[PDB]
Every structure is written in C-alpha cells, then in structure tokens.
Amino acid sequence: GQKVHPNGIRLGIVKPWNSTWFANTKEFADNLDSDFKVRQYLTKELAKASVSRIVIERPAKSIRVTIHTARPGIVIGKKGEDVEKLRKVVADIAGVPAQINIAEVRKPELDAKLVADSITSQLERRVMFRRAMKRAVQNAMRLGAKGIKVEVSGRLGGAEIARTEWYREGRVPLHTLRADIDYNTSEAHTTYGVIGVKVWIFKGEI
Amino acid sequence: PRRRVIGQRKILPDPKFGSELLAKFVNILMVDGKKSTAESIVYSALETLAQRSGKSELEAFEVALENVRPTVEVKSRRVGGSTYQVPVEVRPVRRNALAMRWIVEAARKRGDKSMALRLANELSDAAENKGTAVKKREDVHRMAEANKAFA
Amino acid sequence: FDKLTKKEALMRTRELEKLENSLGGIKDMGGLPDALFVIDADHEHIAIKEANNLGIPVFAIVDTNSDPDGVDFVIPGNDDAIRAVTLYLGAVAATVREGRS
RNA sequence: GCUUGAGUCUCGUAGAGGGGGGUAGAAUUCCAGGUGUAGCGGUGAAAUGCGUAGAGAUCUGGAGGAAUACCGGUGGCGAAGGCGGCCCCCUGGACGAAGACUGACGCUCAGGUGCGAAAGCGUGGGGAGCAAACAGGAUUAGAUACCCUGGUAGUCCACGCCGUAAACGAUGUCGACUUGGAGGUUGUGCCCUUGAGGCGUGGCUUCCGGAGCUAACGCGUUAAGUCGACCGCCUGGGGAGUACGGCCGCAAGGUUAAAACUCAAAUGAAUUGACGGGGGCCCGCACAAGCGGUGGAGCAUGUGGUUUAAUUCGAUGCAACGCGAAGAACCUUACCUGGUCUUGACAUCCACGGAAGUUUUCAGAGAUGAGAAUGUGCCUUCGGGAACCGUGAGACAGGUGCUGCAUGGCUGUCGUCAGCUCGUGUUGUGAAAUGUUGGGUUAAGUCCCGCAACGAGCGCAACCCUUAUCCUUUGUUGCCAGCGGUCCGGCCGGGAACUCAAAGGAGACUGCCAGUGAUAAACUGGAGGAAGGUGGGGAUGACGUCAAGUCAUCAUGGCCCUUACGACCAGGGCUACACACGUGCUACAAUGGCGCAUACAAAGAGAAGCGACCUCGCGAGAGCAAGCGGACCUCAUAAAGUGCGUCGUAGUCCGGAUUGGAGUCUGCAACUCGACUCCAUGAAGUCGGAAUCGCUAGUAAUCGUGGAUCAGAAUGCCACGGUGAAUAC
C-alpha cells in the first residue's frame, strides 16, 4: 500500500477544499461532524441524481451547501420543491439557517466521482468489468481528458481470488504537483463482496 | 568514499596561540560537545608543561608530539584470500592525528588527579619519550618492522 | 521561439537540427512514394528491403559487393565515387524533371 | 569390343607411417669424495619427513633407467588405435609430371579374418622419475578425500593374452552434381626469375559463410544440400545392456540378449527469468577510517514462557518485540467471578396509556418497586397528531464471534532502488527479441552520439513546503538608529531606519571564463555571489514481490450465536513472576559531585483551560485571585556554560535502586493499581564475554524546552533549540 491520495497532495497547489469555513477549536469538531451528517444525508438522498461534489461553507452562523451534480433537473425537480425540502432537512441537521445551491457538472464523463459511480453501478448490475472500464476510458478520452486511468480491484467476475486489472490511456502524471488530476473512488457492493473502483482523470498541466 | 572524493573543513585556530594544530588537539580531547572544558584542560596542562620544561608553549608541545608520531603503520589487505598486515607510509595529517589520539588516549589511561595533570605528565613523559604513547608508537613500529617483507 | 526560456529554446532548436537532418527531404512528401532510387544496395539494404516489402520499384546502383535483392531495376555501377554519383544522379535528376510539362 | 571407372610401368617429391639396431645431450635419483654450516623441505598456515652421525647449497668422478626441451605450427603421416632427438638397415602407403599398357578387372559386404589407446593378466627381465594400494601429517563435525611427506603393483623391455574407451568430426563406405572468400601444407607447368614475383593446374587440410537443409543449434563443394549402390543400427523412460543360456577369455570380464513389474512421462534445442563459492562495470554508514553506544548493573516498557478464575485480542526473521495503545485505578475493556435483562443498551414500523422533565425515601451492587407537586409545548365533526416515557406481539436489533487463504480501504517491505512497460514497424516456425543493447556521461533508461527501429506512458528531474541573501509594502501587541526629558525599565512623547512579523518580488540556470572531451554530452578548475553545481532538509515512494499486516477503526461475501457468542452492573484482571529476549533511562564519576552567584534560546499550548502578583507551607502544594481565547497574559526559571569555594580517588560528598515513616494533588474512589514531595535507608554497579548497533556536518555526542493522548498518570512518541566533534587511504 503505497501511493498518496492525489487530491490531498494538491490541496494548496491546484485543488480546492470541499469545506471552506473558518472555526476556532471550540466548534471545529462540531462543524466538522455537522458536515459529515449533511454529506452523509445529502449523498444518500441524491443517489440517483449523479452527484459529484458537495461543498460546505459557513458564512456567519449559516451553511451554504453547493451540490456539484450532473443532473441538476432531477435535484431541483418540477418547481423546486425538492430543493426547499433538502434545505429544510439540512437546516434540521446543521441547526443553522441553510442555503443550498446547484452547480451543473457538464461533461459528466470527465468527473471521477461520476465515472467511479458509473462503473460501480454497472458492476452491481452484473455486467462484465472489462466493458465498464474500457467504455469509461474510451468515452472519457473522447472529450478532452489528457489522461485517464481506471482501476477496479477485488474478486472481479465472482472469482475466489482477487485481482486488479487497471487500464489507462493518455498521460496521467501523478507525481507532478501542478497536474490537475481529478481522482475519486467508489465501492461496488456485489453479491460476491466489495469491488473497489478508483479513477484518475488528468485534465491539464496547471 | 565509495565514489565521493571529498574536501575538508577549516577549523578555527586556537584562541590563545593561533595554532590549528593545537585546535585539533582540543577537538581530539573534547567529549560530549564541551569545548570550553577541553580548552581549559589544554591551557592548564600545556601551561604547566611550559612552566616545567621551561622551553615555551607549543615547541614543548611540538617536541612531546614529535616523539609519538608514527613513521609507518600496518594495514590489512585481504587480496590473495589471505590476511596480510602490510606496512604503509602514514600521511602527515594522519601522522599528527594519530599522535594526538595516542597522547589523549594514554592521558585518559593515567592515574593522576586532574586531566590537566594527566595530560601534562603524559606530554612530559613524551618529551623524554618514556611514556605510554611512545610505547604505542614503538608497538606500531614493531608491527611494521616485523612485517617489513610486504611492499 | 524566444518565449519563456533560453535553455529549452536551445533544446528545441537542436531538436530541429536532429529532426531536420533525419527527416529532411521526406518532410513535404505526404504519401509513401511511387518509386525509390538508392545509391548503394548493400549500404542501404534496409530501404530496399522495405520497398520490396511494400511493392515499390527499387532503382539501385549496385557495385560488385552488393546484391540484387529485390532491386527491380539494377544498374551495375560504382557506388562510392563522387564523379560517378554526380554524373549518375545528374542523369537521373535530368530525366525526372521531364513530366508532360 | 571401347576408354572417360579400376589397375600396371617410367621419374621424382614430402612425411613423428611401421619393424629391428645403434648412439647423443640436458635433467631427476642414487653412490663415493672435496668445500662448508645450521637449517632444509613443505604449505593457505602447519606438521609428518630429512638434518650437527654434517643435511640443504656447491664442485668432481661414477652408475642406472625412462623420456626425448628449442624446432613445433587448427603442421605432417597413418584405415583406425596412434606415431616427436640423431644415424643405419628392412619395409608399407600417398601425391605429382608426361607417356605407355591391361581393358570393367569395379562398389559395398551379413557370417569370417586381421589390426585395435589405457588399465589389466601370464612368463622372464628391468626399475631413475612418477604413482593406484598403503602408511604417516594435516584439514574437518567426520575426512576411508582434496593438500603435505613417504611409497608397492604399475608405467619400461621380450613374447603371449585381453578386447575395450567421450575408440568422437558423438557424422559407415564408395561415386556424381551444386554460388564464394581468407589461409596452411605438398607437387607441377608457363612468363623479363629483371627479388622475399605474376598467371595457372593437381593432393591433403583449417576458418567463415551463400542457396539448400535442419526442431533449433548449426552443416555448408571435406554437407547435415541434390541423388545413386550396399552395409550397420533405432522404435517411450526405468528395470537393463542386467539376469538365464551359448560362444570367447587364465582371470578380470567381453560378446549375443530377454521378461515380470513400474511410470506418463523420459528426451533434444532454444526462450524468459532466477541463481552461481562465473566474468566485467557501478552504487549505499555496506566495509574500511573514526566517534558514541548495546550485550555486564539497577530501573522503565514491550514480548516469549510460566502462573492464573482471567492474566482480552492482534503484531513475530529483516519489515513483531515502549508495535495497534497519542497515555489499563473505576471508565476504557473486548477477559474472569458473581448478580441480572430478553423486540432488548442501540434502531424503524405498530397498538394502548400518560406531556416529558424536575426534587424524595426505603431495599440492594446499580437498575426494578413506594409515594408529593409540576403536568395541556400547538393544532383536532374529537376516532388523534408534535416531543418524550412505560407496556405487549413481532418483523428484527445486536455480536471487538470465525475466516486477511473469499474482499474493499488503508499500511509495511524490497526501495526514493532506477527501473517497469506499451503502440506501430521489423526479426524468429515459436516462446519471444528489438526498442530498453553499444561508446562516453550522469544522482538518475540523466543527456549526447550511434544503431531496425520510430515513438509514447508510468518512474528520474522540475513544479510544492521549508531553510540560506537582498528589495518592496504595512508597522500593532512587535523594534528602538536618530531625537526630548525620563520615576533609567522602550518607561513615555515619538521615530519608522533596524531586528522582526507576513504578503509580494529578485536570486542559482553549468549563466560567465580556462582546460580536457566525438568540434557532442559532460567533467575538472576559476571568478562573481548569501548560496555552485540535484546548495541543506522534507513532501513526493514506478510495474510488481511477500496468497506480508489488519474481518478489532471502518465497510464487507459466506459461516455461526440470536432467553445468547447479545445487554446492564459491582468486584477482579489486563500491573501476576523460577525465568529468557527486544528497545530505552540512570549510572559506575574529578572533562565530575555539591553549594553560592551569573549569561545566552527556539518552538509550542491555553476557557470544564493557562492561571501572574501577594500570603502561608522545608517542599509537593494551599488561599485570595489579576490578565489572557491570546506577536499583549499565563505555562515559563532554559540547562549544559561561566566565576568562585569544597570534595580528593575513597564504593567515596559517585550512584540512586530498595524499604520504613510523614504527606500534597487529581479523581465517587490511589488496597490490588497513580503521580509528586519531605525525612530516613542507601543495593547492584569501578566501563561490561561471545557478539552487536547508529552516525559523513550543525551530523554523531551531549544539554535542556514544548506538545498530542490526558481529570490524574511518560525514561515512550512527535517537535524545538544550546554547545558541538572525529574520520573517510
């Protein structure tokens, strides 16, 4: 087990943080756990909506949750009853007056959360993994994407030993720190157990 | 030393006599990074050495150290599958480095009161070359003299 | 060319010397050619071997050490005399530059 | 009949072809003698052995046996085995030149016959060296061996036997045809032989290669190519070239030659890797050069074992063993002993009742039971809903239970080692190869050059953080150069220069110079500069390896318990101790111990917190209590250092373990089982056996300080600064 998380080593360099509140030591743990609850809830209740990121920020006793998603229409719905429902329950969880926004992730096959969730969904619909991976690499390289690597792992095809079998195309410069590597990871709970899907997407060199 | 040939770092000379030779002598004597203590011992011991021998400071030191410098020393080879102790000519910096190491080590062996008396008596015993460091030099020279047959 | 670096600009210019002297004449071709004219058959056996591999007519001036491999139009001549190859290429370049005109 | 096959004759040539006889010169051994004297010989080192009865060395004379240096050459001759001084005698074959003659007389060959290395056998000689056996000495765990010192058969001759060898070009003989190159050796012809030349033509032979063949390796006009003639032999490995029988042999044995049984392979050549006590080049505290440790002592902490009611579980070469655990009194806790609960401590959905909540008492170890007030927090053709608590059935909940060899995720490691690959192309029947190798260079598959490769990816480098210098901005709480007075303290007015703070820039790239180098990469040296050649340090850990670690952080497939392997409680244990190991701390002292005075830090933490000042206590601390959510206040005095005095080589004024007494604090609670203080006690230990470890420069060593976890508990861990080496051939 030996590679650094390629979001974490780029946190001040190119990648931003998904939480951008300041807090002293008295409320740092409380704000942090409140963020675990709103991302847990808001991740479970938008499983069909293809959600990429949820960014929390707290401007002066009020949360401001931004849902980067690929299907904004299914998040908002017929006149946005679903949004006001979600800020009602996020205001229930965080205990502050909640705002909520939706940012449309166009080009959803270049986002690693959406790619890993895609391949994970296909693996738990019992399709063969080489199609899922290989289709994901092809259609991601089709639109921009100066590199992509996907990597499934663990008891693939229902075996009794676990393999990995990664694929990559293009250039994925993972030790370069100015590389805009969009990396994310999902787990596929199949009837044989968990199958881990990692995906790195190299977008640009700065 | 596998690849890297090196330089060497320049030591500051002695703050009383301007002698880098004696500065390396207080570094050979120093333990636990305590340089003030070691230079106090060297100033006291060489001061009573200059008072006893009546010569001067660092020419009494230079005579007492001239009697303990090795000429040639043995050295292992392991070339033909055998252990040889070949005699080899000592470089001058190594020559007086070994001189000081033997004086200091023999002075730590002695049984007098203070370190300045142990080392003042060891340098005085090396001025008429009868101390312990001269027995170390004669021992080295018996090893390189017995094994002269390897050059 | 002067943009952003001197060292990398020097690096890139000597990439133009290397790519210019290796891919010199062929850089404006844009196809693979309809014939091949080699000046020594044994010294340039690689090119003859490939043009035979691809069905390209090879026109070689062989010497007495060379081999008529797949040279479609062999010419028994002298490969390493500059008088001979300047006369020789003079005739060939003379007959090339008559198309329908 | 005929001559192109085969053979005969003439003339020469070269030759270690054979058999018999003779002789010569070097050398070894022995014998006799001269000189001469303490070793010689031998080995990795030794010893056995020889030697003052005179060895070895050296000179002279003699005897004897075997072999024949130099020439000597992938040179020659022979059917093969094989044949090596020189000379003579007897003798076989080959080859060449011209001509003559015979005229198919030829080729192969089962049985048969002959020759046939070495060892061996028989009879008789010989016997210098060498040397199976043998003996002694060593080496070794053993050493019936390798090594040493001796040493018999044998090796040598004559005659007879044997009849085999990796008797091998592992290639039967004879003949024909089929591109080349460089040699060697031995003939012969022609041309100015104008020389150690030029042109041919035969015989034998060596190396490389074309087509072709070949499983490949390779063979390649001397075929393993293309054909013909005849012979010999093969039919999976083992058993087994063995047994029985026959023939041969003096014998040893040779030859001919099975079967039962047993295996599903045995084999050849080549490929990729790994390995080698193979070779070349290269690196790293790997060794060397040094400095300080560990192993010895006492204690701390972890582990194995033992004990136990339990001593919870996991980690076990490196890469487990102050590891998970950044902190076991109760809690944590998973374990043990008892007491208890069963839709449950934690969920979701029902149905009924009641707002919940708040202070009480008794029993017991807590929760269960018995009472008093408060109950309506807002809506309901009233059948209820919001929140919370009991009760009942469930579907379930729960599991630190098992499986890391079913998994994910995360981690260690080889290793921050420089490598690992791919596309297209080409080569090979193919596994695969090339690229990636080669000449240089580099820290680096770094970079240049070359090249059946051309390119590309992951890795290296750079981008990132920090540190080292300068500039700009802002100047509080931070700073005080110049000013004014000053309670002499940045203390105040004030100043924004400086330290500094933090943001933004500059800077270092072999950029410049000289030399060496394929005029290339680069290397060596020099200047400037705070810094010089990836400046220092960190982060960053390629494809994969160990079915490495974790199911006990979490998630998770399957299995299992579900009045129990789930849950609650009190007490205990994880702290046990004949022992063994790991990692640390403190020591053994005078480069020090103690007492007094006195100087110089950096980095941090802080509200259920850090807690001044002042008073009390010898002290740990206690009381009152400012200031500070913090460059402002507190933790908080840095200590080694220095200057004085004392101690004086003593188990001592070293060392502090252990133990008794008296306490402080935290915490419901210090008995098991805290931390600290005071008085008393004052072990072991005088530098650590075999062995072993860390470190290459602000490093090791040594000295303190802070933090996380935490109510309290570090000698551990993570950080910070002070002093500050030695050495690298």
Side-chain angles (χ1 to χ4, degrees):
Chain A
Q2 68 264 48
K3 290 177 200 44
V4 78
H5 187 285
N7 187 19
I9 193 67
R10 269 71 179 260
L11 278 177
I13 314 304
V14 289
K15 304 299 285 175
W17 285 267
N18 301 317
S19 294
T20 53
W21 43 266
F22 181 81
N24 282 323
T25 318
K26 308 282 296 171
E27 65 271 13
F28 200 88
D30 288 328
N31 289 330
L32 200 53
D33 176 69
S34 173
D35 296 347
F36 291 109
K37 297 292 209 184
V38 304
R39 296 167 195 271
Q40 183 177 32
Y41 181 74
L42 202 59
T43 297
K44 182 183 176 157
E45 293 294 329
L46 292 176
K48 301 152 203 285
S50 297
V51 57
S52 168
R53 293 168 69 244
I54 28 189
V55 171
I56 311 295
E57 64 186 2
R58 300 187 184 196
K61 300 288 287 209
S62 179
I63 205 170
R64 182 70 63 82
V65 188
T66 300
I67 300 166
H68 292 279
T69 188
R71 290 191 206 168
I74 199 195
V75 179
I76 297 170
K78 182 213 305 273
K79 293 312 293 148
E81 194 271 329
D82 294 330
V83 168
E84 63 192 2
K85 178 158 68 65
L86 290 174
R87 67 171 187 85
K88 183 144 153 75
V89 293
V90 165
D92 290 330
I93 290 171
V96 296
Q99 282 184 8
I100 188 164
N101 297 121
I102 288 97
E104 183 176 357
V105 183
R106 65 191 165 276
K107 298 171 149 86
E109 76 273 7
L110 297 183
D111 184 77
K113 179 61 170 142
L114 303 176
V115 173
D117 182 70
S118 171
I119 300 164
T120 288
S121 298
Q122 295 174 4
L123 291 176
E124 65 188 354
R125 291 178 176 86
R126 309 159 72 140
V127 316
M128 291 164 165
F129 61 91
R130 285 189 293 271
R131 290 182 188 80
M133 294 178 61
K134 195 163 160 203
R135 287 177 199 284
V137 175
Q138 285 170 3
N139 63 8
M141 293 296 291
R142 178 185 182 85
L143 273 82
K146 297 183 186 340
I148 181 167
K149 175 162 66 169
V150 309
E151 193 268 330
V152 311
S153 67
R155 200 191 229 277
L156 291 79
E160 290 171 340
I161 49 98
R163 295 174 291 180
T164 63
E165 198 162 358
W166 60 277
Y167 289 155
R168 73 171 156 73
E169 287 296 326
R171 190 161 69 79
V172 182
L174 209 43
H175 275 232
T176 302
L177 299 176
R178 63 178 174 210
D180 185 73
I181 297 283
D182 188 74
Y183 165 78
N184 210 335
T185 302
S186 182
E187 291 195 347
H189 299 92
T190 63
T191 191
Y192 293 101
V194 178
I195 297 169
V197 177
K198 295 189 174 86
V199 46
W200 298 262
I201 296 170
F202 177 62
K203 288 184 171 59
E205 303 78 8
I206 194 169
Chain B
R2 154 66 55 66
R3 169 193 290 145
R4 191 58 67 203
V5 291
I6 53 173
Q8 65 185 345
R9 67 173 65 73
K10 295 213 303 286
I11 64 178
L12 263 50
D14 185 68
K16 190 177 282 185
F17 298 106
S19 180
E20 290 177 2
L21 194 64
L22 198 144
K24 176 133 287 146
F25 186 78
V26 317
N27 288 127
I28 293 285
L29 195 148
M30 178 174 82
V31 78
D32 297 330
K34 298 177 83 145
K35 200 160 180 191
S36 180
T37 301
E39 67 192 358
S40 299
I41 290 168
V42 170
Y43 289 168
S44 298
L46 272 76
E47 184 179 348
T48 65
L49 182 64
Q51 190 193 345
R52 176 176 308 102
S53 62
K55 292 175 63 66
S56 170
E57 197 83 13
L58 62 85
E59 71 180 0
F61 176 67
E62 195 274 334
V63 160
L65 183 139
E66 188 163 13
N67 287 317
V68 302
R69 285 172 183 157
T71 309
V72 290
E73 67 178 1
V74 296
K75 182 159 180 316
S76 179
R77 285 302 304 144
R78 302 288 295 158
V79 179
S82 292
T83 298
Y84 284 169
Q85 292 295 101
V86 301
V88 70
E89 288 76 10
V90 60
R91 314 295 297 161
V93 181
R94 182 178 170 74
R95 189 190 295 274
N96 54 12
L98 287 171
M100 294 176 182
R101 190 183 297 152
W102 295 339
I103 286 164
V104 174
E105 168 206 325
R108 300 289 269 275
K109 294 294 201 302
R110 293 176 72 84
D112 304 333
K113 287 299 199 67
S114 177
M115 190 64 208
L117 291 175
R118 296 163 77 184
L119 187 125
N121 287 318
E122 181 66 31
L123 290 171
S124 293
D125 288 333
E128 60 266 18
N129 69 15
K130 69 178 177 72
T132 311
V134 297
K135 197 154 194 297
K136 179 71 171 171
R137 179 188 61 80
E138 289 175 355
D139 186 75
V140 161
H141 192 67
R142 287 182 186 83
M143 291 287 296
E145 188 65 26
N147 292 113
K148 194 185 280 307
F150 299 110
Chain C
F1 60 97
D2 196 74
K3 182 69 174 201
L4 290 172
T5 314
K6 301 293 152 164
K7 190 161 197 172
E8 188 180 20
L10 183 63
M11 191 75 67
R12 177 166 293 173
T13 51
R14 65 184 174 78
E15 288 185 350
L16 270 86
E17 267 97 14
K18 182 174 151 61
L19 295 173
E20 187 67 31
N21 66 2
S22 65
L23 297 169
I26 202 168
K27 71 178 181 191
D28 291 334
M29 181 176 282
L32 52 89
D34 297 332
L36 184 73
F37 185 84
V38 301
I39 207 171
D40 195 2
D42 62 346
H43 186 271
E44 287 300 314
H45 61 278
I46 307 97
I48 297 171
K49 176 71 199 312
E50 303 190 4
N52 294 324
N53 189 350
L54 267 66
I56 308 297
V58 180
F59 294 85
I61 168 167
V62 304
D63 203 350
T64 64
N65 59 2
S66 296
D67 198 78
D69 292 320
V71 177
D72 294 333
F73 291 91
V74 62
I75 294 100
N78 193 9
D79 55 355
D80 54 355
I82 58 206
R83 296 299 191 84
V85 303
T86 48
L87 181 137
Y88 193 83
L89 269 59
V92 176
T95 194
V96 166
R97 67 181 178 274
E98 186 56 34
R100 66 181 66 84
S101 294

